[PDB]
PDB file of C-alpha atoms and ligand atoms in Angstrom:
ATOM      1  CA  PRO A   1       9.182  70.660  24.170  1.00  0.00           C
ATOM      2  CA  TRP A   2       6.139  68.699  22.941  1.00  0.00           C
ATOM      3  CA  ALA A   3       6.474  67.839  19.232  1.00  0.00           C
ATOM      4  CA  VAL A   4       2.886  69.141  19.062  1.00  0.00           C
ATOM      5  CA  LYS A   5       1.826  72.737  19.819  1.00  0.00           C
ATOM      6  CA  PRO A   6      -1.128  74.483  21.454  1.00  0.00           C
ATOM      7  CA  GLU A   7      -2.475  75.756  18.115  1.00  0.00           C
ATOM      8  CA  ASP A   8      -1.904  72.380  16.418  1.00  0.00           C
ATOM      9  CA  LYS A   9      -3.502  70.392  19.235  1.00  0.00           C
ATOM     10  CA  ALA A  10      -6.403  72.844  18.960  1.00  0.00           C
ATOM     11  CA  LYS A  11      -7.188  71.737  15.406  1.00  0.00           C
ATOM     12  CA  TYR A  12      -6.441  68.157  16.508  1.00  0.00           C
ATOM     13  CA  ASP A  13      -9.052  68.432  19.271  1.00  0.00           C
ATOM     14  CA  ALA A  14     -11.580  69.543  16.639  1.00  0.00           C
ATOM     15  CA  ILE A  15     -10.903  66.542  14.440  1.00  0.00           C
ATOM     16  CA  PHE A  16     -10.835  64.295  17.505  1.00  0.00           C
ATOM     17  CA  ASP A  17     -14.122  65.777  18.757  1.00  0.00           C
ATOM     18  CA  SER A  18     -15.530  65.743  15.201  1.00  0.00           C
ATOM     19  CA  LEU A  19     -15.844  61.947  15.385  1.00  0.00           C
ATOM     20  CA  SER A  20     -17.526  61.915  18.841  1.00  0.00           C
ATOM     21  CA  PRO A  21     -15.079  61.044  21.607  1.00  0.00           C
ATOM     22  CA  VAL A  22     -16.005  58.512  24.298  1.00  0.00           C
ATOM     23  CA  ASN A  23     -14.852  59.225  27.867  1.00  0.00           C
ATOM     24  CA  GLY A  24     -11.923  60.946  26.103  1.00  0.00           C
ATOM     25  CA  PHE A  25     -11.137  58.392  23.357  1.00  0.00           C
ATOM     26  CA  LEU A  26     -11.514  57.890  19.607  1.00  0.00           C
ATOM     27  CA  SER A  27     -11.634  54.440  18.042  1.00  0.00           C
ATOM     28  CA  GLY A  28      -9.467  53.673  14.997  1.00  0.00           C
ATOM     29  CA  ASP A  29     -12.892  53.654  13.314  1.00  0.00           C
ATOM     30  CA  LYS A  30     -12.966  57.450  13.745  1.00  0.00           C
ATOM     31  CA  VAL A  31      -9.235  58.008  13.275  1.00  0.00           C
ATOM     32  CA  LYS A  32      -8.661  55.534  10.416  1.00  0.00           C
ATOM     33  CA  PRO A  33     -10.947  57.627   8.187  1.00  0.00           C
ATOM     34  CA  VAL A  34      -9.387  60.787   9.642  1.00  0.00           C
ATOM     35  CA  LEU A  35      -5.977  59.446   8.540  1.00  0.00           C
ATOM     36  CA  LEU A  36      -7.316  58.155   5.211  1.00  0.00           C
ATOM     37  CA  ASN A  37      -8.415  61.705   4.418  1.00  0.00           C
ATOM     38  CA  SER A  38      -4.787  62.905   4.385  1.00  0.00           C
ATOM     39  CA  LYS A  39      -4.387  61.275   0.951  1.00  0.00           C
ATOM     40  CA  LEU A  40      -1.702  59.141   2.641  1.00  0.00           C
ATOM     41  CA  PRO A  41      -1.413  55.379   2.256  1.00  0.00           C
ATOM     42  CA  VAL A  42      -2.118  52.929   5.107  1.00  0.00           C
ATOM     43  CA  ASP A  43       1.657  52.815   5.523  1.00  0.00           C
ATOM     44  CA  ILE A  44       1.655  56.361   6.907  1.00  0.00           C
ATOM     45  CA  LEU A  45      -1.513  55.857   8.927  1.00  0.00           C
ATOM     46  CA  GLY A  46      -0.233  52.462  10.078  1.00  0.00           C
ATOM     47  CA  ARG A  47       2.774  54.347  11.408  1.00  0.00           C
ATOM     48  CA  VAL A  48       1.076  57.640  12.309  1.00  0.00           C
ATOM     49  CA  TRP A  49      -1.487  55.736  14.359  1.00  0.00           C
ATOM     50  CA  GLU A  50       0.954  53.402  16.148  1.00  0.00           C
ATOM     51  CA  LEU A  51       3.209  56.264  17.253  1.00  0.00           C
ATOM     52  CA  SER A  52      -0.122  57.978  18.032  1.00  0.00           C
ATOM     53  CA  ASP A  53      -1.691  55.050  19.933  1.00  0.00           C
ATOM     54  CA  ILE A  54      -0.200  55.767  23.376  1.00  0.00           C
ATOM     55  CA  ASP A  55      -2.369  52.980  24.864  1.00  0.00           C
ATOM     56  CA  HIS A  56      -2.325  50.779  21.739  1.00  0.00           C
ATOM     57  CA  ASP A  57      -5.951  49.684  22.284  1.00  0.00           C
ATOM     58  CA  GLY A  58      -7.387  50.548  18.856  1.00  0.00           C
ATOM     59  CA  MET A  59      -8.223  54.098  20.008  1.00  0.00           C
ATOM     60  CA  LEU A  60      -6.798  57.647  20.044  1.00  0.00           C
ATOM     61  CA  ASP A  61      -7.730  59.937  22.969  1.00  0.00           C
ATOM     62  CA  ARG A  62      -7.471  63.738  22.626  1.00  0.00           C
ATOM     63  CA  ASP A  63      -3.746  63.460  23.442  1.00  0.00           C
ATOM     64  CA  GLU A  64      -3.244  60.350  21.283  1.00  0.00           C
ATOM     65  CA  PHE A  65      -5.299  61.688  18.388  1.00  0.00           C
ATOM     66  CA  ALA A  66      -3.139  64.823  18.602  1.00  0.00           C
ATOM     67  CA  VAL A  67       0.171  63.003  18.082  1.00  0.00           C
ATOM     68  CA  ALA A  68      -1.410  61.398  14.994  1.00  0.00           C
ATOM     69  CA  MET A  69      -2.704  64.737  13.631  1.00  0.00           C
ATOM     70  CA  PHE A  70       0.614  66.471  12.994  1.00  0.00           C
ATOM     71  CA  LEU A  71       2.054  63.081  12.041  1.00  0.00           C
ATOM     72  CA  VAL A  72      -0.563  63.145   9.262  1.00  0.00           C
ATOM     73  CA  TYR A  73      -0.392  66.831   8.304  1.00  0.00           C
ATOM     74  CA  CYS A  74       3.417  66.789   8.454  1.00  0.00           C
ATOM     75  CA  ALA A  75       3.519  63.634   6.321  1.00  0.00           C
ATOM     76  CA  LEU A  76       1.908  65.556   3.454  1.00  0.00           C
ATOM     77  CA  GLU A  77       3.879  68.823   3.369  1.00  0.00           C
ATOM     78  CA  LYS A  78       6.779  68.029   5.740  1.00  0.00           C
ATOM     79  CA  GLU A  79       8.517  64.620   5.693  1.00  0.00           C
ATOM     80  CA  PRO A  80       8.100  60.841   5.894  1.00  0.00           C
ATOM     81  CA  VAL A  81       6.925  59.102   9.093  1.00  0.00           C
ATOM     82  CA  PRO A  82       9.155  56.727  11.053  1.00  0.00           C
ATOM     83  CA  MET A  83       7.950  54.034  13.492  1.00  0.00           C
ATOM     84  CA  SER A  84       9.792  55.298  16.566  1.00  0.00           C
ATOM     85  CA  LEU A  85       7.630  57.185  19.044  1.00  0.00           C
ATOM     86  CA  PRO A  86       9.871  60.177  19.738  1.00  0.00           C
ATOM     87  CA  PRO A  87      10.342  61.118  23.400  1.00  0.00           C
ATOM     88  CA  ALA A  88       9.496  64.728  22.508  1.00  0.00           C
ATOM     89  CA  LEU A  89       5.927  63.735  21.687  1.00  0.00           C
ATOM     90  CA  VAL A  90       4.881  61.320  24.453  1.00  0.00           C
ATOM     91  CA  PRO A  91       2.714  62.276  27.435  1.00  0.00           C
ATOM     92  CA  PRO A  92       4.096  61.591  30.912  1.00  0.00           C
ATOM     93  CA  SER A  93       0.902  59.626  31.630  1.00  0.00           C
ATOM     94  CA  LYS A  94       2.307  56.643  29.716  1.00  0.00           C
ATOM     95  CA  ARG A  95       5.346  56.558  32.037  1.00  0.00           C
TER      96      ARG A  95
ATOM     97  CA  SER B   6      -6.399  44.726  17.582  1.00  0.00           C
ATOM     98  CA  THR B   7      -4.919  48.247  17.803  1.00  0.00           C
ATOM     99  CA  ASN B   8      -4.001  49.543  14.322  1.00  0.00           C
ATOM    100  CA  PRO B   9      -6.645  50.119  11.645  1.00  0.00           C
ATOM    101  CA  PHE B  10      -3.885  50.103   8.977  1.00  0.00           C
ATOM    102  CA  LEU B  11      -2.056  46.843   9.804  1.00  0.00           C
TER     103      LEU B  11
HETATM  104 CA1  LIG C 101      -4.995  54.630  22.808  1.00  0.00          CA
END
């Protein structure tokens, strides 16, 4: 299934839409601070964002900002974050 | 230009 859920993407779409999305995209400028609020170092956000940046253009759309939301919340009370975008968390629009 | 933490 999708590493993310419907109830988790729901809170992700509130954080993504809390920065003001553009045509369906958030710029690292809105996510960076969103990831810096998790009390995590830039090493987790540098990895939570990359595996979250499906387009890798310095932005995180609703679907990209979602992959980086659990990657941030699960990095605090779950486990560490690797740098390998898992196939159970990637949208079929990137392939 | 793509990661705000790199
Ligand atoms: Ca992107």
